[PDB]
Amino acid sequence: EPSPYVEFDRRQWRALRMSTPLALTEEELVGLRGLGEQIDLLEVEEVYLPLARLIHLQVAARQRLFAATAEFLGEPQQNPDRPVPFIIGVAGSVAVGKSTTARVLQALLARWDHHPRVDLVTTDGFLYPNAELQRRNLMHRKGFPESYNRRALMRFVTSVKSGSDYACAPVYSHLHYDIIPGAEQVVRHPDILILEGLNVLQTGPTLMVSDLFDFSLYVDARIEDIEQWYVSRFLAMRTTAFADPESHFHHYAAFSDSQAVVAAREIWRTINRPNLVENILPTRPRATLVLRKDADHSINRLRLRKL
Amino acid sequence: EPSPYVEFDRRQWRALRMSTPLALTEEELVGLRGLGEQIDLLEVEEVYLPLARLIHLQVAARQRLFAATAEFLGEPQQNPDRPVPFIIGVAGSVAVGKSTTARVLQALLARWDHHPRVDLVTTDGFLYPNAELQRRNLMHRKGFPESYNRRALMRFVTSVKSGSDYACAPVYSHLHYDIIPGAEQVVRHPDILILEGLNVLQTGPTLMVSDLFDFSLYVDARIEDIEQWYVSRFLAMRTTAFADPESHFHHYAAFSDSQAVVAAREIWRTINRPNLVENILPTRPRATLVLRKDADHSINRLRLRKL
Ligand SMILES: Nc1ncnc2c1ncn2[C@@H]1O[C@H](COP(=O)(O)OP(=O)(O)O)[C@@H](O)[C@H]1O
Ligand SMILES: Nc1ncnc2c1ncn2[C@@H]1O[C@H](COP(=O)(O)OP(=O)(O)O)[C@@H](O)[C@H]1O
Ligand SMILES: CC(C)(CO)[C@@H](O)C(=O)NCCC(=O)O
Ligand SMILES: CC(C)(CO)[C@@H](O)C(=O)NCCC(=O)O
Ligand code: NA
Ligand code: NA
Ligand code: NA
Ligand code: NA
Ligand code: NA
Ligand code: NA
């Protein structure tokens, strides 16, 4: 039966790497991974390099499209010092490691002949402040589609891809568990913009951010494996993030492995799992590329959208 | 404020026509319009020709994209006697005249240097049979997303764009108000496929037909104007379609203008309007191009998606 996709396994996928050069040390790679992520240079070669290649082959082809319309409209060409920004979306569950995938991808792309300005933005900064979430009675739905100012988010990405000289985005603090007053991330006509978030790949009755993606990734893995990673990381943060007297979660630092496991599981069960099942997973079918990880966090299978 | 769209009016739009040649008579145009549609050659020049142009500028650019991926995958090029079919979607309310727009567009495109095989398919043939609709208790929701075998529909379009030599689709009879037993429409590796239907532009938790469109149209107009056209056409069919002793609607032929108006309005109010408001309209934001018609059925404004 015909299919819009093409499946792979490491063996098959690594061959699509070609001459694609490695321009990252085992050290730089380290400052790019999050607590719990395993990514090593091998994986960056057999997985992230082919990906980088494909993305590069597309940025060109994708440019033709905006040019065609530009030509149709009889517009004054298109300054190469400012093409239509290539937007890339990275979606997936909480704790699946999309922040690592996004960081590595960014580094790989910024390191390409001519040094493309490659900006990265997470949707965290588009969550409503805690005060506003409390007002809407959503302090326990952080991460759900409605906990986000999707209008501001859409406005942001639209601004950037429309060619704006610069756009601003609020900043989220994981330390304080809330939006930072007066903080902002300024993005200047990037060549590539990577938007990382839980629900970035979703659709609706209004034009959305996913309707502006030229390429998208969905970091996937088994729900039981991800819960495993979540709980695991929760216990591990008792001595990293939670250890800080300022962490909005400082009281967890003192929990016993047992107490911690109970607490972590409760959050997963009441917040992150429901959201994964009801909102995130239903968006996976549209990802240009799905990166399937195994219990060890390694990407061993990939699903590509050829159609 | 930046926008993904660009608005136009006839004046502005007709200028984008350029050398685009007219290859249709006032006679051929006639056998292409439906009861109630006004389209004349002027409109075909000031509106449909620019459209044809844009579409042509895109088919090329769009080809680069599949080639890029083909190249990425190290595939044996791509025979010009069989490129990736260009899929075009035409959506809109019942009675808004999308069947005319689809027919005219098809004719215009088939009449292009090298004579592209341009096939046209409506979603009518993907409705469940009346027997099956009665079973699901949906005999009064014909046209709603659930009255369609979306799996078969998706399979069909996927088959065609995936390069299949030929694909089949059931055939709907407006005369009998049901699917025709054993009837089928065979489509052979077209260069362009136009898919016309009510809900063709919608999304969901599964990859859909709208995810395969390379270009899409949304024939729009005011809901009161469309109801007007609907009722109007209903009365007019008393002596055309309904007049046939076989029409599943033959009893309406004998209605008085008054009775007819009452009946028509009831259907609009209980079926076609709800579906337009709940399912069709929410899809308009994604149309590559929106053709806005006035009470007289003429397209006087257009909204294009540049992003
Ligand atoms: N409570 C927390 N305190 C500090 N840092 C956190 C906390 N929760 C998550 N983080 C970090 O911020 C990012 C959150 O990742 P998550 O939201 O789990 O998405 P993912 O792991 O798929 O990138 C990761 O770097 C994670 O390690
Ligand atoms: N009851 C009917 N009997 C015969 N033909 C019909 C009937 N209803 C609609 N048609 C015709 O079949 C097509 C249905 O169009 P509709 O389903 O109203 O979409 P649109 O008018 O936007 O193309 C049009 O050609 C219409 O004239
Ligand atoms: C950024 C948060 C809070 C939400 O996006 C999430 O990434 C997280 O790390 N843990 C889930 C806890 C919560 O969502 O309340
Ligand atoms: C093809 C139908 C029936 C539905 O697609 C519709 O186009 C129509 O012409 N009139 C609405 C009547 C009904 O949908 O039952
Ligand atoms: Na941010
Ligand atoms: Na997308
Ligand atoms: Na690994
Ligand atoms: Na059909
Ligand atoms: Na579409
Ligand atoms: Na007209």
XYZ file of C-alpha atoms and ligand atoms in Angstrom:
704
model
C 0.000 0.000 0.000
C 1.400 3.429 -0.999
C 2.672 5.591 1.841
C 3.472 9.271 2.475
C 6.395 8.040 4.575
C 9.679 6.158 4.362
C 11.009 4.214 7.328
C 14.637 3.774 8.273
C 16.997 2.316 10.809
C 20.427 3.704 11.715
C 22.201 1.542 9.143
C 20.064 2.835 6.287
C 19.995 6.409 7.555
C 23.715 6.902 8.188
C 24.473 6.176 4.535
C 22.636 9.355 3.542
C 25.339 11.304 5.318
C 27.752 11.495 2.349
C 30.547 14.051 2.514
C 28.602 15.910 5.175
C 31.433 17.103 7.467
C 31.551 16.933 11.240
C 32.317 20.318 12.803
C 31.755 19.716 16.495
C 33.973 18.366 19.273
C 33.042 15.817 21.923
C 33.371 18.777 24.271
C 31.060 21.288 22.544
C 28.537 18.473 22.177
C 28.587 18.117 25.959
C 27.558 21.693 26.672
C 24.589 21.061 24.401
C 22.910 18.098 26.042
C 20.466 18.107 28.872
C 20.474 16.137 32.053
C 19.852 12.539 31.065
C 20.507 12.808 27.339
C 23.086 10.381 25.951
C 23.976 11.871 22.547
C 27.623 11.206 21.622
C 29.541 12.051 18.436
C 28.738 8.718 16.813
C 24.999 9.470 16.934
C 25.709 12.994 15.677
C 27.422 11.449 12.639
C 25.081 8.562 11.867
C 21.937 10.591 12.568
C 22.292 14.352 12.806
C 24.571 14.794 9.811
C 22.246 13.139 7.267
C 19.491 15.291 8.783
C 21.563 18.424 8.413
C 22.186 17.503 4.768
C 18.527 16.980 3.929
C 17.680 20.255 5.639
C 20.323 21.990 3.527
C 19.059 20.421 0.297
C 15.613 21.773 1.202
C 16.459 25.352 2.213
C 17.448 25.910 -1.414
C 14.436 24.173 -2.953
C 12.156 25.877 -0.446
C 13.530 29.236 -1.572
C 12.262 28.654 -5.122
C 8.748 28.614 -3.759
C 8.755 32.080 -2.269
C 10.591 33.320 -5.351
C 7.917 31.841 -7.619
C 5.248 33.796 -5.791
C 7.517 36.841 -5.734
C 7.887 36.491 -9.486
C 4.154 35.954 -9.910
C 3.557 39.178 -8.007
C 6.158 41.039 -10.045
C 8.239 41.864 -6.987
C 11.802 43.300 -7.019
C 13.607 39.944 -6.681
C 14.985 38.964 -3.321
C 18.126 40.125 -1.676
C 20.370 37.277 -0.809
C 21.331 39.202 2.305
C 17.786 38.456 3.402
C 15.951 35.397 2.027
C 12.640 34.193 3.466
C 13.707 32.679 6.808
C 13.587 28.876 6.919
C 11.453 27.846 9.905
C 12.055 24.507 11.617
C 9.798 23.027 14.267
C 10.866 20.529 16.920
C 8.016 18.888 18.802
C 7.640 16.134 21.325
C 6.774 15.185 24.866
C 8.115 16.747 28.039
C 11.441 15.054 28.835
C 11.921 13.413 25.440
C 15.009 15.519 24.859
C 13.883 17.902 22.172
C 15.974 20.673 23.730
C 19.094 18.631 22.975
C 18.034 17.800 19.432
C 17.258 21.474 18.895
C 20.597 22.629 20.315
C 22.657 20.129 18.338
C 20.776 20.910 15.137
C 21.312 24.624 15.664
C 25.038 24.175 16.185
C 25.351 21.954 13.127
C 23.500 24.432 10.913
C 25.303 27.531 12.190
C 28.499 25.763 11.195
C 27.917 25.801 7.518
C 29.791 27.581 4.775
C 28.856 31.267 4.973
C 27.758 30.934 8.608
C 23.943 31.150 8.576
C 22.392 33.074 11.433
C 20.552 30.207 13.121
C 18.299 31.301 15.983
C 16.513 28.979 18.398
C 13.328 29.779 20.329
C 11.336 27.610 22.729
C 7.660 28.102 23.408
C 8.222 28.373 27.079
C 8.333 32.034 26.786
C 4.942 32.108 25.341
C 3.260 30.521 28.318
C 0.945 32.851 30.184
C 2.493 34.177 33.395
C 1.622 32.225 36.554
C -0.673 35.059 37.624
C -2.583 34.807 34.379
C -2.637 31.008 34.507
C -4.007 31.126 38.028
C -6.641 33.572 36.800
C -7.724 31.135 34.062
C -7.428 28.344 36.632
C -4.723 26.665 34.512
C -1.851 26.388 37.004
C -2.026 22.612 36.531
C -2.186 22.610 32.746
C 1.155 24.228 32.021
C 2.119 22.813 28.650
C -1.446 22.278 27.440
C -2.407 24.262 24.296
C -4.461 26.710 26.344
C -1.611 27.641 28.728
C 0.013 29.453 25.818
C -0.552 32.892 24.303
C -0.793 31.379 20.834
C -1.659 34.744 19.341
C 1.603 36.254 20.536
C 3.453 33.125 19.414
C 1.885 33.180 15.955
C 2.534 36.917 15.720
C 6.178 36.316 16.593
C 6.859 33.654 13.972
C 4.797 35.494 11.393
C 6.865 38.610 12.076
C 10.145 36.718 11.666
C 9.232 34.868 8.467
C 7.563 37.947 6.961
C 11.020 39.534 6.915
C 10.933 41.802 9.987
C 14.282 43.282 11.055
C 13.747 41.946 14.553
C 11.050 40.368 16.707
C 10.758 39.939 20.472
C 9.656 36.996 22.617
C 9.121 36.745 26.405
C 11.533 34.630 28.447
C 10.617 31.723 30.706
C 12.581 30.848 33.839
C 12.654 27.181 34.845
C 14.235 28.332 38.107
C 11.283 30.479 39.142
C 8.741 28.448 37.153
C 7.386 31.642 35.577
C 7.839 34.341 32.931
C 10.682 36.782 33.642
C 9.522 40.410 34.041
C 10.938 42.658 31.323
C 13.081 39.865 29.868
C 13.106 39.415 26.119
C 14.788 37.455 23.352
C 15.426 39.534 20.263
C 15.621 37.693 16.946
C 17.103 39.460 13.905
C 16.213 38.302 10.403
C 17.730 34.841 10.942
C 18.448 32.602 7.982
C 16.961 29.774 9.973
C 14.676 29.784 12.976
C 14.157 26.699 15.069
C 10.990 26.737 17.149
C 11.048 24.166 19.908
C 8.023 23.142 21.886
C 5.473 20.667 23.040
C 2.647 21.534 20.776
C 4.300 23.367 17.963
C 3.076 20.926 15.403
C -0.622 21.368 16.009
C -3.438 22.733 13.864
C -6.672 24.577 14.352
C -9.534 26.825 13.133
C -6.955 29.577 12.727
C -3.695 29.805 10.806
C -0.979 28.542 13.123
C 2.733 28.368 13.707
C 2.871 24.841 12.240
C 1.461 26.286 9.014
C 4.672 28.298 8.705
C 7.143 25.413 9.147
C 9.305 24.525 6.154
C 10.533 21.444 8.002
C 9.605 19.794 11.292
C 10.941 17.237 13.707
C 9.139 15.100 16.209
C 11.324 13.500 18.879
C 9.537 10.269 19.748
C 9.926 7.338 22.126
C 7.705 5.026 24.123
C 5.417 6.657 26.654
C 6.596 4.247 29.372
C 10.184 5.012 28.450
C 9.541 8.747 28.546
C 7.801 8.520 31.934
C 10.850 6.583 33.002
C 13.112 9.424 31.846
C 10.839 12.006 33.472
C 10.820 10.356 36.906
C 14.501 9.579 36.611
C 15.341 13.214 35.822
C 13.094 14.401 38.630
C 15.093 12.448 41.199
C 18.351 13.589 39.612
C 17.372 17.261 39.864
C 17.225 17.082 43.643
C 20.949 17.822 43.594
C 21.078 20.066 40.532
C 18.154 22.404 39.822
C 15.984 21.740 42.890
C 19.073 22.070 45.080
C 19.031 25.823 44.492
C 17.292 27.552 47.441
C 15.502 29.625 44.808
C 14.105 26.858 42.671
C 10.326 27.000 42.787
C 10.818 23.287 43.488
C 13.374 23.521 46.286
C 11.235 21.487 48.688
C 11.655 18.422 46.463
C 15.406 18.347 47.002
C 14.786 16.800 50.432
C 12.533 13.989 49.199
C 13.558 10.363 49.511
C 13.988 8.416 46.297
C 10.605 6.912 47.189
C 8.825 10.175 47.970
C 10.341 11.690 44.845
C 9.193 8.813 42.666
C 5.681 9.134 44.025
C 5.635 12.898 43.414
C 7.143 12.676 39.904
C 4.687 9.953 38.871
C 1.762 12.026 40.074
C 2.757 14.971 37.874
C 3.312 12.716 34.896
C -0.048 11.035 35.427
C -2.021 14.221 35.952
C -0.311 16.638 33.586
C 2.368 15.513 31.169
C 0.895 12.164 30.135
C -2.640 13.498 29.419
C -1.163 16.332 27.364
C 1.105 13.929 25.474
C -1.805 11.614 24.625
C -4.428 14.283 23.916
C -2.357 16.978 22.208
C 1.240 16.122 21.321
C 0.973 12.587 19.909
C -1.921 13.486 17.598
C 0.513 15.900 15.901
C 3.221 13.316 15.171
C 1.632 12.246 11.860
C 2.584 15.636 10.335
C 6.255 15.758 11.332
C 8.547 15.902 8.311
C 10.858 13.630 10.289
C 10.256 11.504 13.356
C 13.273 10.610 15.489
C 12.446 7.389 17.323
C 14.496 6.814 20.456
C 14.879 3.609 22.434
C 14.814 3.224 26.220
C 18.512 4.180 26.206
C 17.638 7.505 24.525
C 19.399 6.569 21.286
C 17.682 7.243 17.973
C 17.492 3.879 16.206
C 14.632 4.393 13.738
C 13.379 7.313 11.649
C 10.172 8.071 9.719
C 10.444 10.566 6.862
C 7.653 12.309 5.016
C 8.363 12.068 1.328
C 4.826 13.268 0.570
C 1.165 44.209 11.626
C 2.883 41.522 9.495
C 0.580 39.114 7.691
C 0.785 35.673 6.047
C -1.630 37.024 3.438
C -1.958 39.609 0.684
C -5.332 41.068 -0.231
C -6.464 42.101 -3.680
C -9.339 43.436 -5.700
C -10.007 42.704 -9.378
C -8.058 45.751 -10.542
C -4.916 44.697 -8.694
C -5.324 41.009 -9.484
C -5.941 41.253 -13.231
C -2.578 42.959 -13.714
C -0.825 39.760 -12.638
C -2.186 38.130 -15.760
C 0.671 39.191 -18.080
C 1.013 37.380 -21.393
C -1.087 34.560 -19.995
C -3.129 33.554 -23.078
C -6.842 32.871 -23.244
C -7.606 29.486 -24.809
C -11.318 29.072 -24.211
C -14.399 30.217 -26.122
C -17.535 31.800 -24.691
C -19.148 28.534 -25.751
C -16.818 26.028 -24.043
C -17.032 28.193 -20.929
C -20.794 27.667 -20.986
C -20.632 23.885 -20.829
C -18.478 24.323 -17.740
C -20.704 26.358 -15.461
C -23.379 25.133 -13.154
C -26.927 26.262 -12.782
C -26.775 29.748 -11.323
C -23.110 30.505 -11.932
C -22.398 33.715 -13.848
C -18.772 33.298 -14.976
C -18.138 34.980 -18.348
C -14.904 35.360 -20.332
C -14.067 38.700 -18.742
C -13.897 37.100 -15.282
C -11.884 34.223 -16.757
C -9.338 36.780 -17.994
C -9.179 39.148 -15.031
C -9.297 36.345 -12.459
C -8.674 32.816 -13.680
C -5.729 33.615 -15.927
C -3.564 35.233 -13.222
C -4.458 32.213 -11.076
C -3.440 29.815 -13.806
C -0.127 31.671 -14.112
C 0.682 31.517 -10.413
C -0.201 27.831 -10.386
C 2.172 27.287 -13.308
C 4.991 29.226 -11.639
C 4.528 26.945 -8.621
C 4.343 23.523 -10.296
C 7.968 24.061 -11.300
C 9.158 25.365 -7.932
C 7.183 22.650 -6.168
C 9.009 20.051 -8.254
C 12.367 21.130 -6.801
C 11.140 20.044 -3.407
C 10.489 16.425 -4.250
C 13.716 16.388 -6.249
C 15.664 17.695 -3.252
C 14.418 14.809 -1.152
C 14.994 12.440 -4.064
C 18.552 13.723 -4.253
C 18.955 13.469 -0.488
C 17.865 9.845 -0.698
C 20.195 9.155 -3.609
C 17.347 8.148 -5.897
C 17.599 7.619 -9.693
C 16.441 11.128 -10.682
C 12.905 11.595 -11.876
C 11.476 10.841 -15.238
C 9.907 13.849 -16.783
C 7.292 11.532 -18.237
C 6.163 11.167 -14.643
C 6.853 13.953 -12.119
C 5.278 13.996 -8.654
C 1.646 14.901 -9.421
C 0.666 18.443 -8.428
C -2.410 18.235 -6.186
C -4.862 21.134 -6.041
C -7.712 21.401 -3.567
C -10.901 23.395 -4.092
C -13.020 23.855 -0.985
C -16.097 25.789 -0.043
C -19.733 25.668 0.934
C -22.501 23.767 -0.806
C -23.768 25.950 -3.670
C -20.858 28.395 -3.676
C -19.903 27.251 -7.152
C -16.707 25.359 -6.544
C -17.649 22.861 -9.255
C -17.480 25.685 -11.800
C -14.193 27.045 -10.493
C -12.801 23.517 -10.574
C -14.019 22.867 -14.122
C -12.735 26.161 -15.501
C -9.384 25.729 -13.775
C -9.057 22.220 -15.169
C -9.783 23.381 -18.701
C -7.329 26.260 -18.419
C -4.549 24.003 -17.139
C -5.133 21.193 -19.639
C -4.670 23.831 -22.316
C -1.067 24.511 -21.670
C 1.953 23.893 -23.839
C 2.638 20.148 -23.786
C -0.940 19.371 -22.727
C -0.743 18.295 -19.067
C -3.030 15.458 -18.071
C -5.275 17.355 -15.659
C -7.737 15.141 -13.789
C -10.566 16.366 -11.572
C -12.162 14.430 -8.705
C -14.935 15.468 -6.324
C -15.368 13.998 -2.878
C -18.894 13.023 -3.575
C -17.769 9.656 -4.521
C -16.242 9.139 -1.206
C -19.451 9.564 0.726
C -20.658 6.397 2.394
C -23.524 4.758 0.505
C -27.019 5.673 1.729
C -27.336 2.218 3.280
C -24.179 2.766 5.273
C -25.177 6.315 6.201
C -28.532 5.075 7.422
C -26.693 2.440 9.448
C -24.558 5.126 11.130
C -27.709 7.240 11.426
C -26.117 9.939 9.233
C -28.693 10.286 6.444
C -29.098 13.925 7.498
C -25.412 14.765 7.746
C -24.436 14.172 4.139
C -21.513 16.512 3.608
C -20.350 16.476 7.229
C -16.806 15.105 7.781
C -18.170 11.845 9.163
C -20.362 11.071 6.119
C -17.165 10.403 4.190
C -14.882 7.373 3.981
C -11.849 9.549 4.648
C -9.595 6.514 4.748
C -10.511 5.561 1.198
C -10.197 9.205 0.148
C -6.772 9.591 1.743
C -5.702 6.263 0.253
C -6.802 7.468 -3.173
C -4.887 10.747 -3.157
C -1.891 9.128 -1.515
C -1.902 6.502 -4.263
C -2.040 9.140 -7.007
C 0.674 11.418 -5.615
C 2.900 8.471 -4.666
C 3.203 7.778 -8.395
C 0.740 4.903 -8.908
C -0.062 4.029 -12.533
C -3.755 4.360 -11.787
C -6.130 4.734 -8.851
C -9.883 4.201 -8.557
C -12.613 6.234 -6.856
C -16.337 5.472 -6.368
C -18.885 7.555 -8.274
C -21.724 9.570 -6.765
C -25.034 10.125 -8.548
C -26.858 13.376 -7.795
C -29.815 11.898 -9.677
C -30.236 8.950 -7.327
C -28.691 10.744 -4.337
C -26.380 7.777 -3.720
C -23.200 5.941 -4.721
C -23.417 4.124 -8.067
C -22.934 0.335 -7.787
C -19.816 -0.836 -9.619
C -19.110 2.634 -11.024
C -15.568 3.933 -10.855
C -13.380 6.812 -11.971
C -9.916 5.707 -12.999
C -7.120 8.260 -12.684
C -3.801 7.633 -14.461
C -0.634 9.332 -13.245
C -2.002 12.828 -13.933
C 0.340 15.794 -14.043
C -2.202 17.665 -11.991
C -5.050 16.435 -9.843
C -7.780 18.749 -8.674
C -9.698 17.502 -5.652
C -12.974 19.309 -5.180
C -15.041 19.123 -2.049
C -16.654 20.608 0.977
C -14.166 19.661 3.579
C -11.058 18.959 1.615
C -9.093 21.577 3.430
C -9.467 20.167 6.910
C -6.979 18.725 9.385
C -6.929 16.124 12.093
C -5.137 13.622 14.386
C -4.188 11.708 11.251
C -2.368 12.686 8.073
C -4.996 13.971 5.669
C -5.719 14.855 2.084
C -5.109 18.560 2.800
C -1.594 17.615 3.915
C -0.930 16.523 0.333
C -2.100 19.717 -1.414
C 0.540 21.747 -3.240
C -2.005 24.515 -3.766
C -5.556 25.100 -2.560
C -8.535 27.266 -3.327
C -11.405 28.294 -1.140
C -14.438 29.692 -2.959
C -15.973 32.134 -0.495
C -18.973 34.445 -0.252
C -21.379 35.657 2.395
C -23.395 33.003 4.183
C -26.629 34.925 3.528
C -25.667 35.242 -0.117
C -24.881 31.541 -0.357
C -28.175 30.571 1.307
C -29.753 32.858 -1.236
C -28.045 30.960 -4.065
C -28.961 27.620 -2.490
C -32.681 28.382 -2.172
C -32.687 30.032 -5.566
C -31.108 26.972 -7.204
C -33.497 24.683 -5.360
C -36.506 26.396 -6.914
C -34.800 26.435 -10.309
C -34.170 22.680 -10.211
C -37.882 21.942 -10.118
C -37.779 22.111 -13.909
C -34.288 20.727 -14.480
C -32.969 18.008 -12.160
C -36.039 17.427 -9.969
C -38.189 17.320 -13.102
C -36.751 13.899 -13.914
C -39.168 11.182 -12.692
C -36.074 9.419 -11.368
C -34.589 12.207 -9.319
C -34.553 11.175 -5.679
C -36.105 14.636 -5.316
C -38.852 14.358 -7.923
C -41.590 15.233 -5.429
C -40.145 18.741 -5.077
C -40.802 19.551 -8.720
C -44.475 20.078 -7.842
C -43.853 22.501 -4.971
C -45.024 26.092 -5.138
C -42.359 28.775 -5.029
C -43.469 29.212 -1.413
C -43.422 25.537 -0.453
C -40.081 25.176 -2.204
C -38.589 28.134 -0.371
C -39.728 26.708 2.939
C -38.266 23.281 2.128
C -34.949 24.649 0.797
C -34.495 26.897 3.839
C -35.099 23.986 6.176
C -32.311 21.939 4.581
C -29.951 24.887 4.633
C -30.751 25.580 8.277
C -30.466 21.992 9.447
C -27.662 20.647 7.282
C -25.653 22.887 4.994
C -25.373 25.953 7.225
C -24.259 24.043 10.372
C -21.654 22.179 8.329
C -20.438 25.409 6.724
C -20.056 27.124 10.110
C -18.671 24.161 12.061
C -16.453 22.485 9.464
C -15.898 24.327 6.185
C -15.331 27.934 7.296
C -12.787 26.952 9.957
C -10.655 25.622 7.073
C -10.624 28.857 5.054
C -7.601 30.268 6.925
C -5.367 27.635 5.252
C -6.421 28.135 1.629
C -3.521 29.225 -0.561
C -6.039 31.448 -2.331
C -9.492 32.610 -1.327
C -11.866 33.657 -4.106
C -14.367 36.087 -2.601
C -17.609 36.379 -4.537
C -20.283 39.040 -4.216
C -24.053 38.513 -4.154
C -23.933 38.464 -7.971
C -21.505 35.508 -7.849
C -18.624 37.548 -9.268
C -15.194 37.281 -7.676
C -14.245 40.825 -6.671
C -11.637 40.251 -3.949
C -8.894 37.685 -3.355
C -6.743 36.676 -0.365
C -3.398 35.041 -1.138
C -1.115 33.177 1.217
C 2.394 34.420 0.671
C 3.517 32.647 3.851
N 12.096 21.950 37.019
C 13.140 22.252 36.252
N 14.121 23.039 36.717
C 15.162 23.346 35.965
N 15.284 22.898 34.726
C 14.343 22.112 34.197
C 13.233 21.762 34.956
N 12.457 20.990 34.202
C 13.045 20.859 33.016
N 14.189 21.538 33.004
C 15.125 21.645 31.862
O 14.637 22.568 30.870
C 14.362 21.812 29.680
C 12.975 21.181 29.827
O 12.829 20.061 28.953
P 11.396 19.358 28.747
O 10.565 20.695 29.076
O 11.508 18.246 29.716
O 11.654 19.170 27.168
P 12.814 18.199 26.618
O 13.501 17.419 27.672
O 12.107 17.252 25.527
O 13.828 19.142 25.800
C 15.425 20.713 29.725
O 16.732 21.277 29.571
C 15.235 20.281 31.177
O 16.421 19.623 31.627
N -30.160 17.690 -6.096
C -29.377 17.822 -7.162
N -29.679 17.196 -8.310
C -28.908 17.319 -9.375
N -27.810 18.058 -9.361
C -27.447 18.706 -8.251
C -28.232 18.606 -7.109
N -27.652 19.331 -6.158
C -26.547 19.865 -6.671
N -26.414 19.490 -7.941
C -25.308 19.867 -8.848
O -24.116 19.112 -8.564
C -23.124 20.039 -8.093
C -23.369 20.281 -6.601
O -22.772 21.509 -6.179
P -22.690 21.891 -4.618
O -22.676 20.359 -4.127
O -23.891 22.744 -4.493
O -21.205 22.493 -4.788
P -20.929 23.805 -5.679
O -22.156 24.457 -6.192
O -20.064 24.790 -4.746
O -19.948 23.336 -6.864
C -23.453 21.312 -8.874
O -23.214 21.115 -10.271
C -24.959 21.340 -8.624
O -25.585 22.132 -9.636
C 8.415 23.777 30.949
C 7.586 22.790 31.771
C 6.948 23.155 33.105
C 6.355 23.063 30.906
O 6.647 23.372 29.533
C 7.721 21.296 31.551
O 8.770 21.335 30.578
C 8.414 20.474 32.640
O 9.637 20.425 32.596
N 7.767 19.694 33.501
C 6.323 19.489 33.628
C 5.856 20.249 34.880
C 4.667 21.120 34.459
O 4.445 21.155 33.225
O 4.033 21.685 35.382
C -23.722 16.519 -2.793
C -24.723 17.070 -1.778
C -25.917 16.270 -1.274
C -23.781 16.728 -0.623
O -22.384 16.821 -0.945
C -24.857 18.564 -1.558
O -23.934 18.994 -2.564
C -26.127 19.250 -2.069
O -26.134 19.588 -3.246
N -27.124 19.639 -1.280
C -27.251 19.470 0.169
C -28.278 18.355 0.417
C -27.632 17.355 1.383
O -26.417 17.557 1.621
O -28.380 16.462 1.847
Na 11.566 31.859 24.717
Na 4.027 21.567 9.772
Na 22.920 7.113 21.683
Na -15.897 11.045 -7.577
Na -3.497 22.491 2.491
Na -18.994 37.752 -12.829
